[PDB]
Design a protein around this ligand. Structure first.
Ligand SMILES: OCc1n[nH]nc1-c1ccc2c(-c3cc4cc(CN5CCCCC5)ccc4[nH]3)n[nH]c2c1
Length: 272
């Protein structure tokens, strides 16, 4: 019953796009920050529906929405760290330990989503945000859909995603399982974090870069910059046949995935 507590000031645009804009909003009274997605209306109702069933530390939180005419307002968790995209150095990537930690968190979020029958369908660095403690959070469920309901799996057929990150079966088959597709895009994200470049414009035999990969020419630019341990994992994720592709439970058993590399975030320290 505190006056003004429901007032939010839009401080700045966090990002724009065909679906509208996302702005940083600060509470007039508490100064708490949240991200407000503004949709001009003229998918959205489905996005809200999907967001309402999400609750995980590696998934951007949904606080609520307000119709107010033809402009939908989505109140979402503000991730002060920005996009994972900006943590990747062009043609370099990032330190392996950091990439491993981010990959661990990405897997946690994906395991959660798949557990409740939801597939993201557009996993990429631009959609992976970081909070104040660099914790990764999966965002933007505008392309997400239910692939399992009442314990029955529904095969997908809709062409969704972003070419460099899309699995080859989405371009070669009429129908396909949802989960291996998200696993594949996570592998491309791992490649990007470790090499600072995408392997191919798209996973097609017509694409020379892709053909080279299937021929195991790992001495080529992308893969040459990646250590043997994480590369062995990528060899299991970027497998053309989705039925032979490694699943998440098995990714969790992979040698590199479990290799001690990253230390704590530090905080104390004083001698004598
Ligand atoms: O699932 C949630 C969702 N669905 N759709 N959109 C989202 C969605 C999109 C973006 C964000 C963000 C966010 C974007 C962002 C960008 C920067 C970079 N900075 C911005 C100001 C100018 C200088 C550069 C820094 C921190 C940021 N935090 N937080 N929460 C979001 C939710």
């Amino acid at each position: 019953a505190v006056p003004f507590v429901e007032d939010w000031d839009l401080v700045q645009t966090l990002g724009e796009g065909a679906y509208g804009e996302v702005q940083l909003a600060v509470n007039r009274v508490t100064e708490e920050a949240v991200a407000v997605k503004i949709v001009d209306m003229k998918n959205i109702k489905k996005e809200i529906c999907i967001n309402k069933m999400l609750n995980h530390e590696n998934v951007v939180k949904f606080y609520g929405h307000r119709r107010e005419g033809n402009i939908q307002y989505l109140f979402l968790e503000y991730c002060s760290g920005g996009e994972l995209f900006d943590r990747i150095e062009p043609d370099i990537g990032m330190p392996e330990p950091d990439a491993q930690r981010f990959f661990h968190q990405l897997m946690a979020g994906v395991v959660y989503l798949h557990g409740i029958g939801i597939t993201h369908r557009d996993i990429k660095p631009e959609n992976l945000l970081l909070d104040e403690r660099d914790n990764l959070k999966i965002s933007d469920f505008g392309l997400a859909t239910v692939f399992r309901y009442n314990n029955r799996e529904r095969l997908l057929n809709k062409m969704c995603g972003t070419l460099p990150y899309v699995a080859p079966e989405l371009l070669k088959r009429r129908e396909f399982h949802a989960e291996p597709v998200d696993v594949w895009s996570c592998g491309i994200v791992l490649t990007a974090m470790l090499a600072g470049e995408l392997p191919w414009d798209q996973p097609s035999d017509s694409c020379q870069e892709y053909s080279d990969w299937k021929e195991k020419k790992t001495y080529l630019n992308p893969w040459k910059k990646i250590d043997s341990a994480p590369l062995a994992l990528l060899h299991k994720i970027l497998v053309e046949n989705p039925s032979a592709r490694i699943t998440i439970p098995d990714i969790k058993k992979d040698r590199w995935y479990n290799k001690p590399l990253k230390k704590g975030a530090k905080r104390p320290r004083v001698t004598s």
